[PDB]
Amino acid sequence: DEEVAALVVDNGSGMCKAGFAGDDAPRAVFPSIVGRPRKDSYVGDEAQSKRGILTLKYPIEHGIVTNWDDMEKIWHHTFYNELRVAPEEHPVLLTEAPLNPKANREKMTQIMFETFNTPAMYVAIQAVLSLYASGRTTGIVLDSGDGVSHTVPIYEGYALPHAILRLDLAGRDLTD
Amino acid sequence: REIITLQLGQCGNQIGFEFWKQLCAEHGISPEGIVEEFTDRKDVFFYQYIPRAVLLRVIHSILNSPYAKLYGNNWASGFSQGEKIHEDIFDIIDREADGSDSLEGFVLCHSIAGTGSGLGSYLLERLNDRYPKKLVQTYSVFPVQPYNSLLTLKRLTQNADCLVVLDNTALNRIATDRLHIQSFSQINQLVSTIMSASTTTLRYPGYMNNDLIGLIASLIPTPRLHFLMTGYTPLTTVLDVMRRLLQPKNVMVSNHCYIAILNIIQGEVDPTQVHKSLQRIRERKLANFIPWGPASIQVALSRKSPYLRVSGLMMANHTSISSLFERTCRQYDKLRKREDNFDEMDTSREIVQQLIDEYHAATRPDYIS
Numbered sequence A: 001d002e003e004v005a006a007l008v009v010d011n012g013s014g015m016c017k018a019g020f021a022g023d024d025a026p027r028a029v030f031p032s033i034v035g036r037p038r039k040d041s042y043v044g045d046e047a048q049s050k051r052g053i054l055t056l057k058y059p060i061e062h063g064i065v066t067n068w069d070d071m072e073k074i075w076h077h078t079f080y081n082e083l084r085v086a087p088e089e090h091p092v093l094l095t096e097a098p099l100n101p102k103a104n105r106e107k108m109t110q111i112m113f114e115t116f117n118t119p120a121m122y123v124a125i126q127a128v129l130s131l132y133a134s135g136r137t138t139g140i141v142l143d144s145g146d147g148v149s150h151t152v153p154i155y156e157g158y159a160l161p162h163a164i165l166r167l168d169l170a171g172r173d174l175t176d
Numbered sequence B: 001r002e003i004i005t006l007q008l009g010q011c012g013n014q015i016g017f018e019f020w021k022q023l024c025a026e027h028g029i030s031p032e033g034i035v036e037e038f039t040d041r042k043d044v045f046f047y048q049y050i051p052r053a054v055l056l057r058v059i060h061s062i063l064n065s066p067y068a069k070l071y072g073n074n075w076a077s078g079f080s081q082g083e084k085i086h087e088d089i090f091d092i093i094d095r096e097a098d099g100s101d102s103l104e105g106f107v108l109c110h111s112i113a114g115t116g117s118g119l120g121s122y123l124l125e126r127l128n129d130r131y132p133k134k135l136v137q138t139y140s141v142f143p144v145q146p147y148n149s150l151l152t153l154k155r156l157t158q159n160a161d162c163l164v165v166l167d168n169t170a171l172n173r174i175a176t177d178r179l180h181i182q183s184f185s186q187i188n189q190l191v192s193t194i195m196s197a198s199t200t201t202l203r204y205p206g207y208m209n210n211d212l213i214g215l216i217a218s219l220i221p222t223p224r225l226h227f228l229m230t231g232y233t234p235l236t237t238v239l240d241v242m243r244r245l246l247q248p249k250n251v252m253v254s255n256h257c258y259i260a261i262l263n264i265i266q267g268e269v270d271p272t273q274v275h276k277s278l279q280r281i282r283e284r285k286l287a288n289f290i291p292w293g294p295a296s297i298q299v300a301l302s303r304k305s306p307y308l309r310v311s312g313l314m315m316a317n318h319t320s321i322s323s324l325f326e327r328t329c330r331q332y333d334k335l336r337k338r339e340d341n342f343d344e345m346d347t348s349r350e351i352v353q354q355l356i357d358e359y360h361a362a363t364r365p366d367y368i369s
Ligand SMILES: Nc1nc2c(ncn2[C@@H]2O[C@H](COP(=O)(O)OP(=O)(O)O)[C@@H](O)[C@H]2O)c(=O)[nH]1
Pocket: B009, B010, B011, B014, B015, B072, B073, B111, B113, B114, B115, B116, B117, B141, B142, B143, B168, B184, B185, B187, B188, B191
């Protein structure tokens, strides 16, 4: 093969899933959390394990990135700790929530190319990828995760933003 | 080992209550005396958490505080009333002593200026009767005031095993100089910082100074010269903190020479350059020492409370402390010629004269004998 492996990173409100394109399942899954003392930054399971001595942050609590400084740390963690690869050496496919603000899409792009120096990247809507996985390009996806749920109508591969609905009721609420 | 604290009079209760607030916040202890989630050895001053305090109107304002879940004016009048309740208050101490694992000492916080001062002098003698093997350190505070001040001095010179002086005239000048207050609750902020900093090496264990006698055995050369003074600079390299402590503007005291010095650096300073600074401070000769016996300067590090930057405290034994007794002494004589035996005042006046006579002779090349 001439091409290096491409990375697939699913940014979840509660859990991030990361791995290599072509594989049947993610190689790693970890909590979307970053913690600092009440090693300076803790990310993923370690932040959770040592939460007793840390102040936890959830940078993508409801599917949308709210703190880019900590989101950058989650991505750093994803590449160097979880996947053990150098991002500048692999194309990266990232996922985003439905109705993600345009400015956020540009921010993610700028960070990948300027901060991580990715050779290539792409961003796809989560619901659309799930529909693809089912072997379809048209249909409506009910995506219910940890911090948010969405109903996303998709036609011919394109999500229909005007018909997308967000429900602030998901796994977290059910646990409580 | 544990250390039981006592709080006498209006001053002792206030500076002790502020000492415990600062010591609770320094640790992870909620005002409800319950440990919050959020290494620091806290068994010495807290009991499994309960403070080992013995408080003695002001108590009500303490009980109306958010910290309720944490537990005349003559010297003769203050001495007699302690005799009539002799058995009463000791039952509180006797149960706390035997309930303690291995007692070490008795911290006393009181002002010698008057029911509390009189009660203190009484209790200081009885502790010598019952417990012979327990240190008694007193965080006395200086101001008919001349009378009461010298009487308690007669007991503090032969009963109390150590003593740390804190005079209001030096603290009040600081509040107007670097704090610009123009109150009691304001200057006590500084007293609490010195008290909390004094026992820092006891709560955060290190290679040395893991017991109260470890700090005292170096400074006090003979049982007579048991008076100390303090210095607190930040109101950063270690050489900066040492040079700022040896300036007269910072000491809490209104020829002469030093007997022993102890420095407490509480910051995150680099612990490799600490031995360097003691090499250079010796060269400039910033302090003059005793000629008879050998003396040196001591620096000890610690760690600040993370739940709450470099600070510093200096415990010294300077023979210039003799001047403070002189003021009380001279003030007494002027009142003695102006107005059942009045013989106790005579003995107290005499014994403090020997203490002053020790200091002025402690600075000579022949203090031996
Ligand atoms: N350093 C200091 N001294 C105090 C404080 N409050 C009172 N004093 C001293 O206590 C003396 C008054 O004693 P007082 O409370 O009348 O005695 P009591 O009436 O027998 O309790 C004064 O001379 C003050 O110097 C304080 O907050 N700090």
